[PDB]
Coordinates of C-alpha atoms in Angstrom, one line a residue:
Chain A
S1 CA -34.0 207.3 103.2
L2 CA -34.6 204.2 105.2
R3 CA -38.4 204.1 104.8
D4 CA -37.9 204.6 101.1
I5 CA -35.9 201.5 100.5
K6 CA -38.3 199.3 102.5
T7 CA -41.2 200.0 100.2
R8 CA -39.0 199.1 97.2
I9 CA -38.0 195.8 98.9
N10 CA -41.7 195.0 99.7
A11 CA -42.9 195.7 96.2
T12 CA -40.1 193.7 94.5
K13 CA -40.8 190.8 96.9
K14 CA -44.5 190.8 95.8
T15 CA -43.4 190.8 92.1
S16 CA -40.9 188.0 92.8
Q17 CA -43.7 185.9 94.3
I18 CA -46.0 186.5 91.2
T19 CA -43.1 185.5 88.9
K20 CA -42.2 182.3 90.8
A21 CA -45.8 181.1 90.9
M22 CA -46.2 181.6 87.1
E23 CA -42.9 179.6 86.7
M24 CA -44.5 176.7 88.5
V25 CA -47.7 176.7 86.4
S26 CA -45.8 177.1 83.1
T27 CA -43.7 174.1 84.0
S28 CA -46.8 172.0 84.4
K29 CA -48.3 173.0 81.0
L30 CA -44.9 172.5 79.3
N31 CA -44.5 168.9 80.5
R32 CA -48.1 168.1 79.5
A33 CA -47.9 169.7 76.1
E34 CA -44.7 167.8 75.3
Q35 CA -46.4 164.5 76.3
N36 CA -49.5 165.4 74.2
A37 CA -47.3 166.2 71.1
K38 CA -45.5 162.9 71.6
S39 CA -48.9 161.2 71.6
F40 CA -49.7 162.7 68.2
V41 CA -46.1 162.1 66.9
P42 CA -46.7 158.4 66.1
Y43 CA -49.9 159.5 64.2
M44 CA -47.7 161.9 62.2
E45 CA -45.0 159.2 61.4
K46 CA -47.7 156.6 60.5
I47 CA -49.7 159.0 58.3
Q48 CA -46.7 160.6 56.6
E49 CA -45.3 157.2 55.4
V50 CA -48.7 155.7 54.2
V51 CA -49.9 158.9 52.6
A52 CA -46.6 159.2 50.7
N53 CA -46.4 155.6 49.4
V54 CA -50.2 155.6 48.5
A55 CA -49.9 159.1 46.8
Chain B
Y1 CA -64.9 230.8 125.3
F2 CA -67.1 230.5 122.2
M3 CA -67.7 226.9 122.9
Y4 CA -68.8 227.7 126.5
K5 CA -71.3 230.1 125.0
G6 CA -72.5 227.2 122.8
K7 CA -71.4 228.0 119.3
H8 CA -69.4 225.5 117.3
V9 CA -65.7 226.2 117.0
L10 CA -62.7 225.0 114.8
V11 CA -59.0 225.5 115.7
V12 CA -56.2 224.9 113.2
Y13 CA -52.5 224.7 114.2
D14 CA -50.4 225.2 111.0
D15 CA -47.4 223.2 112.2
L16 CA -47.1 221.5 115.6
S17 CA -43.5 220.3 114.9
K18 CA -42.1 223.8 115.0
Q19 CA -43.8 224.2 118.5
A20 CA -42.0 221.0 119.6
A21 CA -38.7 222.3 118.2
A22 CA -39.1 225.6 120.2
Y23 CA -39.6 223.5 123.3
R24 CA -36.5 221.5 122.6
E25 CA -34.3 224.5 122.2
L26 CA -35.8 226.2 125.3
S27 CA -35.3 223.1 127.4
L28 CA -31.7 222.4 126.2
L29 CA -30.7 226.0 127.1
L30 CA -32.2 225.3 130.6
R31 CA -30.0 222.2 131.1
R32 CA -32.7 219.6 131.4
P33 CA -31.9 215.9 130.9
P34 CA -32.6 215.0 127.2
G35 CA -34.1 211.9 125.6
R36 CA -34.6 210.4 122.1
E37 CA -33.3 212.7 119.4
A38 CA -32.8 215.4 121.9
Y39 CA -36.5 216.2 122.7
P40 CA -37.1 216.6 126.5
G41 CA -39.1 213.8 128.0
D42 CA -42.1 216.1 128.7
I43 CA -43.2 216.4 125.0
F44 CA -46.0 213.9 125.0
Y45 CA -47.6 215.5 128.1
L46 CA -47.2 219.0 126.7
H47 CA -49.1 218.0 123.5
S48 CA -51.7 216.0 125.5
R49 CA -52.3 219.2 127.6
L50 CA -53.0 220.9 124.3
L51 CA -55.0 218.3 122.4
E52 CA -57.4 217.0 125.2
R53 CA -59.2 220.3 125.7
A54 CA -61.1 219.6 122.5
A55 CA -64.5 218.2 123.3
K56 CA -68.2 218.0 122.5
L57 CA -70.0 219.2 125.7
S58 CA -73.4 217.7 126.7
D59 CA -76.8 219.4 126.6
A60 CA -76.4 220.2 130.3
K61 CA -73.3 222.1 129.4
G62 CA -74.6 223.7 126.3
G63 CA -74.1 221.5 123.2
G64 CA -70.9 223.2 121.9
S65 CA -67.9 221.7 120.2
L66 CA -64.2 222.4 119.6
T67 CA -62.9 220.3 116.7
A68 CA -59.1 220.6 116.1
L69 CA -56.9 220.0 113.1
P70 CA -53.2 219.8 114.0
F71 CA -50.5 219.3 111.2
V72 CA -47.1 217.6 111.4
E73 CA -44.4 217.8 108.7
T74 CA -42.6 214.5 108.3
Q75 CA -39.0 214.4 107.0
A76 CA -38.7 212.4 103.7
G77 CA -41.7 210.1 104.5
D78 CA -40.3 209.4 107.9
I79 CA -42.5 207.4 110.3
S80 CA -41.9 205.8 113.7
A81 CA -40.1 209.0 114.8
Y82 CA -40.8 210.6 118.1
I83 CA -43.1 213.5 117.4
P84 CA -45.2 211.7 114.7
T85 CA -45.7 208.6 116.9
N86 CA -46.6 210.7 119.9
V87 CA -49.2 212.7 117.9
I88 CA -50.4 209.6 116.0
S89 CA -51.1 208.0 119.4
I90 CA -53.1 211.0 120.7
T91 CA -55.4 211.9 117.8
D92 CA -58.6 210.0 117.0
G93 CA -57.6 209.7 113.3
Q94 CA -54.9 210.6 110.9
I95 CA -54.7 211.7 107.3
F96 CA -51.4 210.8 105.5
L97 CA -50.5 212.9 102.4
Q98 CA -48.1 211.4 99.8
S99 CA -45.6 213.5 97.8
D100 CA -45.3 210.8 95.1
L101 CA -49.1 210.9 94.8
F102 CA -49.1 214.7 94.4
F103 CA -46.6 214.7 91.6
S104 CA -48.7 212.0 89.9
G105 CA -51.8 214.3 89.5
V106 CA -54.0 213.2 92.4
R107 CA -55.0 216.4 94.3
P108 CA -55.3 217.0 97.2
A109 CA -53.2 213.8 97.5
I110 CA -54.7 211.5 100.2
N111 CA -53.8 207.9 100.7
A112 CA -56.9 205.9 101.6
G113 CA -54.7 202.9 102.6
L114 CA -53.0 204.5 105.6
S115 CA -55.6 207.1 106.7
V116 CA -58.2 206.1 109.3
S117 CA -61.0 207.7 111.3
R118 CA -62.2 205.9 114.5
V119 CA -65.3 208.2 114.7
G120 CA -66.1 207.5 111.0
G121 CA -69.5 206.3 109.9
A122 CA -71.3 208.0 112.8
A123 CA -70.6 211.6 111.7
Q124 CA -71.8 211.3 108.1
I125 CA -75.3 212.2 107.0
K126 CA -77.4 209.0 106.4
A127 CA -77.4 209.5 102.7
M128 CA -73.6 209.7 102.8
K129 CA -73.3 206.8 105.1
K130 CA -74.9 204.5 102.5
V131 CA -72.7 205.6 99.5
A132 CA -69.4 206.3 101.4
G133 CA -69.4 202.9 103.2
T134 CA -69.5 201.0 99.9
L135 CA -66.9 203.4 98.3
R136 CA -64.4 202.4 101.0
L137 CA -64.8 198.7 100.2
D138 CA -64.4 199.3 96.4
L139 CA -61.2 201.4 96.7
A140 CA -59.6 199.0 99.3
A141 CA -60.2 196.0 97.0
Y142 CA -58.6 197.8 94.0
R143 CA -55.7 199.2 96.0
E144 CA -54.4 195.7 96.6
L145 CA -55.3 194.3 93.1
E146 CA -53.5 197.2 91.4
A147 CA -50.5 197.1 93.8
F148 CA -49.3 193.8 92.2
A149 CA -51.3 193.1 89.0
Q150 CA -50.8 196.4 87.2
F151 CA -47.3 195.5 86.0
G152 CA -48.5 192.6 83.8
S153 CA -50.3 193.8 80.7
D154 CA -53.3 191.5 80.6
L155 CA -55.3 190.0 83.5
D156 CA -58.6 188.2 84.2
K157 CA -61.7 190.0 82.9
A158 CA -63.2 190.5 86.4
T159 CA -59.9 192.1 87.5
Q160 CA -59.8 194.3 84.4
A161 CA -63.2 195.5 85.5
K162 CA -62.1 196.2 89.0
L163 CA -59.0 198.1 87.8
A164 CA -61.3 200.2 85.5
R165 CA -63.6 201.1 88.4
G166 CA -60.6 202.0 90.6
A167 CA -59.0 204.2 88.0
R168 CA -62.3 206.1 87.4
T169 CA -62.7 206.3 91.2
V170 CA -59.4 208.1 91.7
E171 CA -60.0 210.4 88.7
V172 CA -63.5 211.4 89.9
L173 CA -62.0 212.2 93.3
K174 CA -59.6 214.8 91.9
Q175 CA -60.5 218.4 92.7
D176 CA -59.5 222.0 92.1
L177 CA -58.1 224.6 94.5
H178 CA -60.2 226.8 96.8
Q179 CA -63.5 225.6 95.2
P180 CA -65.4 223.7 98.0
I181 CA -68.3 221.5 96.7
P182 CA -71.5 221.4 98.8
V183 CA -72.4 218.0 100.3
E184 CA -75.7 217.8 98.3
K185 CA -73.7 217.5 95.0
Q186 CA -71.0 215.3 96.5
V187 CA -73.5 212.5 97.4
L188 CA -74.9 212.8 93.8
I189 CA -71.5 212.4 92.2
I190 CA -70.4 209.5 94.5
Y191 CA -73.8 207.8 93.9
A192 CA -73.3 208.2 90.2
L193 CA -69.8 206.6 90.6
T194 CA -70.7 203.6 92.9
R195 CA -73.9 202.7 91.0
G196 CA -71.8 202.5 87.8
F197 CA -73.2 205.2 85.5
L198 CA -69.7 206.3 84.5
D199 CA -68.6 203.1 82.5
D200 CA -69.5 204.7 79.1
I201 CA -67.4 207.8 79.8
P202 CA -63.5 207.9 79.3
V203 CA -61.0 208.5 82.2
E204 CA -59.6 211.7 80.8
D205 CA -63.1 213.3 80.2
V206 CA -64.3 212.8 83.8
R207 CA -63.1 216.1 85.3
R208 CA -65.4 217.6 82.5
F209 CA -68.3 215.3 83.3
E210 CA -68.3 216.7 86.8
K211 CA -68.0 220.3 85.6
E212 CA -71.0 220.0 83.1
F213 CA -73.0 217.9 85.5
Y214 CA -73.0 220.3 88.5
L215 CA -74.2 223.0 86.2
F216 CA -77.0 220.7 85.0
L217 CA -77.8 219.9 88.7
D218 CA -78.4 223.6 89.4
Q219 CA -80.4 224.0 86.1
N220 CA -82.5 220.9 87.0
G221 CA -83.0 218.9 90.2
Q222 CA -83.4 221.6 92.9
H223 CA -86.0 219.5 94.9
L224 CA -83.5 216.6 95.3
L225 CA -81.0 219.0 96.9
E226 CA -83.7 220.6 99.1
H227 CA -84.7 217.2 100.5
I228 CA -81.0 216.4 101.2
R229 CA -80.4 219.8 102.7
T230 CA -82.7 219.5 105.8
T231 CA -83.7 215.8 105.8
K232 CA -80.1 214.5 105.5
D233 CA -81.7 211.7 103.5
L234 CA -81.2 210.1 100.0
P235 CA -84.0 211.0 97.6
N236 CA -86.2 208.3 95.9
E237 CA -84.0 206.2 93.6
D238 CA -86.5 206.4 90.6
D239 CA -86.1 210.2 90.4
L240 CA -82.4 210.2 91.0
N241 CA -81.8 207.8 88.1
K242 CA -84.1 209.9 85.9
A243 CA -82.0 212.9 86.7
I244 CA -78.6 211.3 85.9
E245 CA -80.0 209.6 82.7
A246 CA -81.1 213.0 81.4
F247 CA -77.8 214.6 82.1
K248 CA -76.1 211.7 80.2
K249 CA -78.3 212.7 77.3
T250 CA -76.8 216.2 77.3
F251 CA -73.1 215.6 77.9
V252 CA -70.8 215.2 74.9
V253 CA -68.0 212.5 75.0
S254 CA -64.6 213.3 73.4
Chain C
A1 CA -54.3 175.3 124.1
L2 CA -54.9 173.8 120.6
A3 CA -53.8 170.3 121.7
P4 CA -56.1 167.2 122.1
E5 CA -55.1 166.8 125.8
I6 CA -56.4 170.3 126.6
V7 CA -59.1 171.2 124.1
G8 CA -60.2 168.0 122.5
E9 CA -59.7 165.4 119.7
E10 CA -62.3 166.7 117.3
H11 CA -61.4 170.3 118.0
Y12 CA -57.8 169.6 117.0
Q13 CA -58.7 167.9 113.8
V14 CA -61.3 170.6 112.9
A15 CA -58.9 173.6 113.5
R16 CA -56.0 172.1 111.6
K17 CA -58.3 171.4 108.6
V18 CA -59.5 175.0 108.7
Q19 CA -56.0 176.5 108.8
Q20 CA -54.8 174.2 106.0
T21 CA -57.7 175.3 103.9
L22 CA -57.0 179.0 104.4
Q23 CA -53.3 178.6 103.9
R24 CA -53.9 176.9 100.5
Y25 CA -56.3 179.7 99.6
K26 CA -53.6 182.4 100.5
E27 CA -51.2 180.9 97.9
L28 CA -53.9 180.5 95.2
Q29 CA -55.3 184.1 94.8
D30 CA -52.6 185.6 92.5
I31 CA -52.9 182.7 90.0
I32 CA -56.7 183.3 90.2
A33 CA -56.0 187.1 89.6
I34 CA -53.7 186.8 86.6
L35 CA -54.4 183.5 84.9
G36 CA -57.9 182.6 84.0
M37 CA -59.9 181.5 87.0
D38 CA -61.2 178.6 84.9
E39 CA -57.6 177.3 84.8
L40 CA -57.7 176.2 88.5
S41 CA -58.1 172.5 88.9
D42 CA -61.5 171.3 90.1
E43 CA -60.0 170.1 93.4
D44 CA -58.4 173.5 93.9
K45 CA -61.7 175.0 92.8
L46 CA -63.3 173.1 95.7
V47 CA -60.7 174.5 98.2
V48 CA -61.4 178.0 96.7
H49 CA -65.2 177.7 97.2
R50 CA -65.0 176.5 100.8
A51 CA -62.3 178.9 101.7
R52 CA -64.6 181.8 100.6
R53 CA -67.4 180.5 102.9
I54 CA -64.9 179.8 105.8
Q55 CA -63.4 183.3 105.5
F56 CA -66.9 184.9 105.7
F57 CA -68.4 182.6 108.4
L58 CA -65.6 183.6 110.8
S59 CA -67.4 186.9 110.9
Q60 CA -70.0 187.4 113.6
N61 CA -72.9 189.7 114.4
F62 CA -72.2 191.6 117.6
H63 CA -73.9 193.4 120.5
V64 CA -71.3 196.2 120.2
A65 CA -72.4 196.8 116.6
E66 CA -75.7 198.0 118.1
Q67 CA -74.1 201.5 118.4
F68 CA -72.4 201.5 115.0
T69 CA -74.9 199.7 112.8
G70 CA -77.8 198.8 115.1
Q71 CA -78.2 195.0 114.5
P72 CA -78.9 192.7 117.6
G73 CA -76.0 190.2 117.3
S74 CA -75.8 187.0 119.6
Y75 CA -73.6 184.6 121.6
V76 CA -72.4 181.2 120.4
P77 CA -71.4 178.2 122.6
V78 CA -68.3 176.2 121.6
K79 CA -70.2 173.1 120.5
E80 CA -72.2 175.1 117.9
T81 CA -69.1 176.8 116.5
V82 CA -67.2 173.5 116.1
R83 CA -70.2 171.6 114.7
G84 CA -71.1 174.5 112.3
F85 CA -67.5 174.4 110.8
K86 CA -67.9 170.6 110.5
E87 CA -71.0 171.5 108.4
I88 CA -69.0 174.0 106.4
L89 CA -66.2 171.5 105.7
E90 CA -68.6 168.7 104.8
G91 CA -69.9 170.7 101.8
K92 CA -73.7 169.8 101.5
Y93 CA -74.4 173.5 102.3
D94 CA -72.1 174.7 99.5
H95 CA -75.1 175.7 97.5
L96 CA -76.0 178.6 99.9
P97 CA -74.5 181.9 98.7
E98 CA -71.4 183.5 100.1
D99 CA -73.0 186.8 101.0
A100 CA -75.3 185.2 103.6
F101 CA -72.3 184.0 105.7
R102 CA -71.3 187.5 106.9
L103 CA -72.4 188.7 110.4
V104 CA -74.2 185.5 111.6
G105 CA -74.1 183.4 114.8
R106 CA -75.3 179.9 113.6
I107 CA -75.6 178.0 110.3
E108 CA -79.4 178.2 110.9
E109 CA -79.0 182.0 110.8
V110 CA -77.2 181.5 107.4
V111 CA -80.2 179.5 106.2
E112 CA -82.5 182.3 107.4
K113 CA -80.5 185.2 105.8
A114 CA -80.5 183.3 102.5
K115 CA -84.2 182.6 103.1
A116 CA -84.8 186.3 103.1
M117 CA -82.9 186.4 99.8
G118 CA -85.1 183.3 99.1
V119 CA -82.3 180.8 98.5
Chain D
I1 CA -51.6 187.3 56.6
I2 CA -53.3 184.7 58.7
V3 CA -52.5 185.1 62.4
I4 CA -53.2 182.9 65.4
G5 CA -52.8 185.0 68.5
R6 CA -53.8 188.4 70.0
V7 CA -50.4 190.0 70.1
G8 CA -49.7 189.0 66.5
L9 CA -53.1 190.5 65.5
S10 CA -52.3 193.7 67.4
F11 CA -48.9 194.2 65.7
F12 CA -50.4 193.4 62.2
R13 CA -53.3 195.8 62.8
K14 CA -51.0 198.7 63.7
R15 CA -48.9 197.8 60.6
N16 CA -52.3 197.6 58.7
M17 CA -51.5 194.6 56.6
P18 CA -54.7 192.6 56.1
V19 CA -55.6 189.5 58.1
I20 CA -57.8 187.1 56.0
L21 CA -58.5 184.8 58.9
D22 CA -58.1 184.9 62.7
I23 CA -58.6 182.8 65.9
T24 CA -57.6 183.5 69.5
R25 CA -57.7 182.3 73.2
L26 CA -57.2 178.6 72.3
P27 CA -57.2 176.2 75.2
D28 CA -53.7 175.4 76.6
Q29 CA -54.4 171.8 75.5
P30 CA -55.4 172.3 71.8
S31 CA -57.5 169.5 70.2
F32 CA -57.8 168.7 66.5
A33 CA -61.5 169.7 66.2
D34 CA -60.8 173.3 67.4
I35 CA -58.1 174.0 64.8
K36 CA -59.8 171.9 62.2
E37 CA -62.1 174.9 61.5
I38 CA -59.3 177.3 60.7
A39 CA -57.2 174.5 59.1
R40 CA -60.1 173.6 56.8
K41 CA -60.6 177.3 56.0
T42 CA -57.0 178.1 55.2
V43 CA -56.5 174.9 53.1
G44 CA -59.9 175.7 51.6
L45 CA -58.4 179.0 50.4
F46 CA -55.4 177.2 48.8
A47 CA -57.6 174.4 47.3
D48 CA -60.2 176.7 45.7
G49 CA -57.2 178.5 44.1
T50 CA -57.3 181.9 46.0
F51 CA -53.7 181.3 47.0
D52 CA -50.8 180.1 44.9
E53 CA -48.3 179.3 47.7
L54 CA -48.5 179.0 51.5
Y55 CA -46.1 179.4 54.4
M56 CA -45.9 178.9 58.2
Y57 CA -43.8 180.8 60.8
Chain E
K1 CA -21.2 156.4 111.5
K2 CA -22.0 154.1 108.6
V3 CA -25.7 155.1 108.5
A4 CA -25.2 158.8 109.5
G5 CA -23.1 159.7 106.4
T6 CA -25.7 158.3 104.0
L7 CA -28.5 160.0 106.0
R8 CA -26.7 163.3 105.8
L9 CA -26.3 163.1 102.0
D10 CA -30.0 162.0 101.8
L11 CA -31.4 165.1 103.6
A12 CA -29.0 167.5 101.9
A13 CA -30.0 166.3 98.4
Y14 CA -33.8 166.1 99.2
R15 CA -34.1 169.6 100.7
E16 CA -33.2 171.4 97.5
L17 CA -35.0 168.7 95.3
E18 CA -38.2 169.3 97.4
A19 CA -38.2 172.9 96.2
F20 CA -38.9 171.3 92.7
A21 CA -40.7 168.1 93.9
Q22 CA -44.5 168.8 93.5
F23 CA -45.0 167.7 89.9
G24 CA -45.0 163.9 90.4
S25 CA -43.9 163.1 86.8
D26 CA -40.7 165.0 85.9
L27 CA -37.9 162.6 85.0
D28 CA -37.5 158.8 85.1
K29 CA -37.1 156.9 88.3
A30 CA -33.6 158.3 88.8
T31 CA -35.0 161.7 90.0
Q32 CA -37.9 159.9 91.8
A33 CA -35.6 157.6 93.9
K34 CA -34.4 160.9 95.5
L35 CA -38.1 161.8 96.0
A36 CA -39.0 158.4 97.5
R37 CA -36.0 158.3 99.8
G38 CA -36.4 161.9 100.9
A39 CA -40.1 161.4 101.7
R40 CA -39.5 158.3 103.8
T41 CA -36.5 160.1 105.4
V42 CA -38.6 163.1 106.5
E43 CA -41.3 160.7 107.8
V44 CA -38.8 158.7 109.9
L45 CA -37.1 161.7 111.5
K46 CA -40.2 163.1 113.1
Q47 CA -40.8 162.2 116.8
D48 CA -43.7 162.1 119.2
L49 CA -43.8 164.9 121.8
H50 CA -41.7 164.4 125.0
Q51 CA -41.1 160.7 124.7
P52 CA -37.3 160.0 124.3
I53 CA -35.8 157.1 122.2
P54 CA -33.3 154.4 123.2
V55 CA -30.0 154.2 121.3
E56 CA -29.7 150.6 120.0
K57 CA -33.2 150.8 118.5
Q58 CA -32.3 154.3 117.2
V59 CA -29.4 152.8 115.3
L60 CA -31.5 149.9 114.1
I61 CA -34.3 152.1 112.7
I62 CA -31.7 154.4 110.9
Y63 CA -30.1 151.3 109.4
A64 CA -33.5 150.1 108.2
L65 CA -34.2 153.5 106.6
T66 CA -30.7 154.0 105.0
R67 CA -30.4 150.5 103.5
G68 CA -33.7 150.6 101.5
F69 CA -35.8 147.9 103.1
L70 CA -38.6 150.5 103.5
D71 CA -38.7 151.3 99.8
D72 CA -41.6 149.0 98.9
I73 CA -43.5 149.9 102.1
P74 CA -46.2 152.5 101.1
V75 CA -45.4 156.2 102.1
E76 CA -48.8 156.8 103.9
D77 CA -48.2 154.2 106.7
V78 CA -44.4 154.9 107.1
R79 CA -44.6 156.1 110.8
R80 CA -46.8 153.2 112.1
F81 CA -43.9 150.9 111.0
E82 CA -41.6 152.5 113.7
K83 CA -44.1 152.0 116.6
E84 CA -44.7 148.3 115.8
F85 CA -41.0 147.7 115.1
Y86 CA -39.8 149.0 118.5
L87 CA -41.9 146.5 120.5
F88 CA -41.4 143.6 118.0
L89 CA -37.6 144.1 117.9
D90 CA -37.6 143.7 121.7
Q91 CA -39.6 140.5 121.5
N92 CA -38.0 138.8 118.4
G93 CA -34.8 140.8 117.7
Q94 CA -33.0 140.8 121.1
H95 CA -29.9 139.2 119.6
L96 CA -29.4 142.4 117.5
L97 CA -29.7 144.6 120.5
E98 CA -27.1 142.5 122.4
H99 CA -24.9 142.7 119.3
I100 CA -24.9 146.5 119.2
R101 CA -24.4 146.7 123.0
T102 CA -21.6 144.2 122.6
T103 CA -19.7 145.6 119.7
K104 CA -20.6 149.3 119.1
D105 CA -21.0 147.9 115.6
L106 CA -23.9 147.1 113.2
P107 CA -25.5 143.7 113.8
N108 CA -23.9 140.7 112.0
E109 CA -25.2 141.4 108.5
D110 CA -26.0 137.8 107.6
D111 CA -29.0 137.4 109.9
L112 CA -29.8 141.1 110.0
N113 CA -31.9 141.0 106.8
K114 CA -33.8 137.9 108.0
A115 CA -34.5 139.3 111.4
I116 CA -35.7 142.6 109.9
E117 CA -37.8 140.7 107.3
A118 CA -39.7 138.9 110.0
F119 CA -40.8 142.2 111.4
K120 CA -41.6 143.5 107.9
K121 CA -44.0 140.6 107.5
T122 CA -45.4 141.1 111.0
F123 CA -46.2 144.7 110.1
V124 CA -49.5 144.9 108.1

């Protein structure tokens, strides 16, 4: 019935909104975490090659 | 007639919609111009002639009453239809019952979200007014938070708390069939719920916490009930907490 | 009537700041509900805290409540509404607790209600 | 087993396999001092000789 | 026609990219240029209430937008640039207005940059 489908549309629209918002915030943390890792990547390259040759 | 004598009265109409249908069939056979659906245009006047005789007469007229409880059966959760919108405009409140609630274990199934009483607050006893007013706030706040956030597994701590309080609230509001509970022991269970004495107890065991508690409340605490009976007033909070804490000594958790 | 030629210059800037604050709160509640509330940035945390106060201080104590709840209520001239919201948006009063702001007619009343609570 | 994360710990507990060490709810920006405590514990286990080989998944 | 086709592609491309725009650091300048152009485009296309614009200055502002002279100009003050430009272009730029009224065509491109540059300096 008509008033049965409207409730399903409304509830799905609310879940769609929750999922879109969590996509935005995960994008922000992804870009930062990749930059942070690249910050510690030269530390890993430097340390690996000195610790090997000294070892 | 009984109200004119001065005694309180209650009238129940078991289905108004069947009355409306009898009017439709009677009018159509009389060759009267029809309207929406086919209901004759007089329907709203016919029901208002029925529903506005209910009253609370003044002390000069005798102090009587005539409360009325009409019922309407909606087809498949239909709304905005002709008879339901007419009656929903006339009546000073409405209770909406949900089939999908009933088959989910809430009984009698009552949706707090869509049910309203314009007179509400004034009618209650003063003890009830304090506890029932806060209970409305609690259940409205969790109705929205659960409507979206229940699908995800883990949430914020403060929301997991409000979800726990709402789940216990609906389980503590489940009731049996043809076993009315006197108001004196309603306020004491709702007070135990709102003030948060039920956190320790699991959701499944609550319908037994009630059962074993009301027996305890007739074995101990008769003075509390007596003050509420005639005063309409909440007893002193020191003694009420002493009573509930003793029962929580007796009751055995699964 | 919310245009500077009809209502007034300050009134236009005040009302648009209020609506932008509440619109930014309306899109932040679900993240607050399902991520940790500490994850909200300190600037958005400021918008949250003031949106809480704004949402409550649009409530008002009323003469018609005398039947339903009994309290006196009162009347507020326009200048005191617009200035009080300028006080809300400035933020020096952000220390006073959110519960005080319900059912009041002036920011001085909000100071009094907290005063009863002792804040 | 050494598990970093609640849903990992939940699966391992149902399976029952032991979890020598655990840490959870790390900040979304993890810093070296945080995981230095567990890193120093796990390598302390290998260094003191309580483990003979070590893996990461 | 020359400045309309570029503007049409600019709004079409920015409207979808704005749905992803809020992060600030995403890709290198190639993505951002579409951010920078779209932001200035949306600023220039707004109009004050009930005051209608004249055609030969309308063409000249759209040319200024779509050729990139605005790209250094800070985003916050982009509107104020139009108000100052309309009066200055009447004072100092009349030869360009006569050119458009003469030709239906864009001002002679050689002095067009110089004449616009004098306004750009006059704007502060």
